[PDB]
Amino acid sequence: IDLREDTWTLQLYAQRYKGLSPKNSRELQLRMEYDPLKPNLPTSGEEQNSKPEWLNTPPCLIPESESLDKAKGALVGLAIGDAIGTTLEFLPRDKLHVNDMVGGGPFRLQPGEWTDDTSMALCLAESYISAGRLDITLFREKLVRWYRHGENSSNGRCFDIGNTTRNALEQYLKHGASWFGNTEPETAGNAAIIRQAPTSIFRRKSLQRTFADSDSQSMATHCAPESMASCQFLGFILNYLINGSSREKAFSPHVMPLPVRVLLINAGEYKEKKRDEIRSSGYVIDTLEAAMWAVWNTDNFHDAILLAANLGDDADSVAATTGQIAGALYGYSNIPKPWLDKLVQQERISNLAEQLFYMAPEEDF
């Protein structure tokens, strides 16, 4: 099943995964009745204010310090994937290969210099540490300082900003804190999933706050529903991994509300795909599916990063996304030590992950 098919075709196909949808509440069900005073539909739903089981956070069964290793893995792994994949950004698959942190790429980078993936992630992480919550205006201001003056860049300048992200900061500069836009499907690019790890670290104790912060962080620049929901799905994957679930548990299907292309990723369709059926474009659905695929088809952090980067095309974004998942799965301590050395600002990035990890608020009750 080709994720680029039309959503009418995908939706008819996806009926086989009706089971992955949470049931309506009693009240949403009434709102879907032809006649709410004369209900027709099953009336077994739970109350609208009640916590559904798919938001019940699994208690962390690994040691806290193992979770900490995985939280550091998620954020440092993002930057690692970023710095390796940039080498092949824009290149045709299999025309060139990368298998070490060598820099180069379109922006002629030194080894270990990361790009817009990590810069945006750092802005997001810093805004959490400052405000103690997702603060979209503060996050945008930090993004503005990165874009306009090179704050939080690996080499002093903003050099690789995505078009959708650029328009959002331009629109925010022009219209102020109440602006939202980039709602059209053209704008369903990578930039919000490639910066996701800090939200998952900060909300590691609350699936519901992960769900609420993940689409919100995306809307800072990207309001396409496929971007928002891809952040929620990745954020859930990171949560399960940071809290110690095996790859099998985390990559099995989860009950959660998702639009059909993200739902099909949740359902595991990539598990059956060959490399030449996996796309690595800047479309958020392609990127997310390729990252999941790269992690499912490798056994260690090193190999997951190299499989993703060597997909070519938007190799940068797929490796940064794979870096988040694989870093959460295998842990900071299993990232190759030579890569940590070359990675620019590696200590600062690991300490931000650690700070987010310890600041993580308690689950709501």
């Binding site: 009418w8 009926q15 949470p22 049931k23 879907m32 032809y34 979209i136 804190a177 709602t183 998702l258």
Partner: protein, 185 residues
């Protein structure tokens, strides 16, 4: 006409249920998407939230759909919801409404036909589980309102009264009649 002046008659004379809706909806929005909250006045956010309560919905949508009288009070309630909806960013994609229609209504849903409901139309981004009919809806007058709920869990995308849709696809698969609605603005 104030939001409080609009459901005053739907509730006990003491209680100021518009203020209660607004407070809960503000608290939910603060937790779930604080910046979206700043786009809405007290009456906008309280009205949308009220639409999602049982007593609110069953007073509003049956009146707009012609089953009960559409009083000036219910009219101002409607107007506050839509004023709020007009501020939110567009949901541009596909959402679903799982429902069971009387046969003579399903009969009117043919490819090439047009649909326009006087009430609000609730949809959800999630694939629907129940209903003889699954209505896929593409448009972009519909707005995501889950951030006003407690758990942000149901992905409700709300379409305002008198949104017109063309029926652009239809098929029965397993036991279920699928319809495709495209908003015609």
């Amino acid at each position: 006409h104030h939001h409080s002046q609009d459901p005053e008659n739907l509730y006990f004379q003491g209680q100021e249920q518009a203020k209660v809706w607004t407070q809960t909806a503000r608290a939910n929005a603060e937790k779930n998407n604080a910046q979206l909250s700043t786009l809405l006045t007290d009456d906008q956010i309280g009205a949308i939230y009220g639409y999602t309560t049982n007593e609110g919905y069953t007073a509003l949508n049956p009146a707009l759909r012609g089953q009960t009288p559409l009083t000036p009070e219910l009219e101002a309630f409607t107007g506050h919801v839509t004023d709020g909806l007009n501020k939110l960013p567009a949901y541009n994609g596909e959402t679903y409404r799982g429902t069971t229609l009387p046969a003579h209504i399903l009969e009117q849903n043919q490819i090439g036909g047009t649909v326009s409901d006087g009430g609000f139309m609730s949809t959800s981004a999630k694939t629907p589980f129940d209903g003889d009919v699954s209505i896929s809806v593409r448009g972009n007058s519909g707005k995501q309102i889950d951030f006003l709920s407690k758990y942000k869990n149901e992905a409700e995308v709300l379409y305002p009264p008198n949104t017109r849709f063309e029926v652009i696809n239809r098929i029965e698969q397993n036991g279920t009649t699928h319809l495709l609605y495209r908003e015609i603005p």
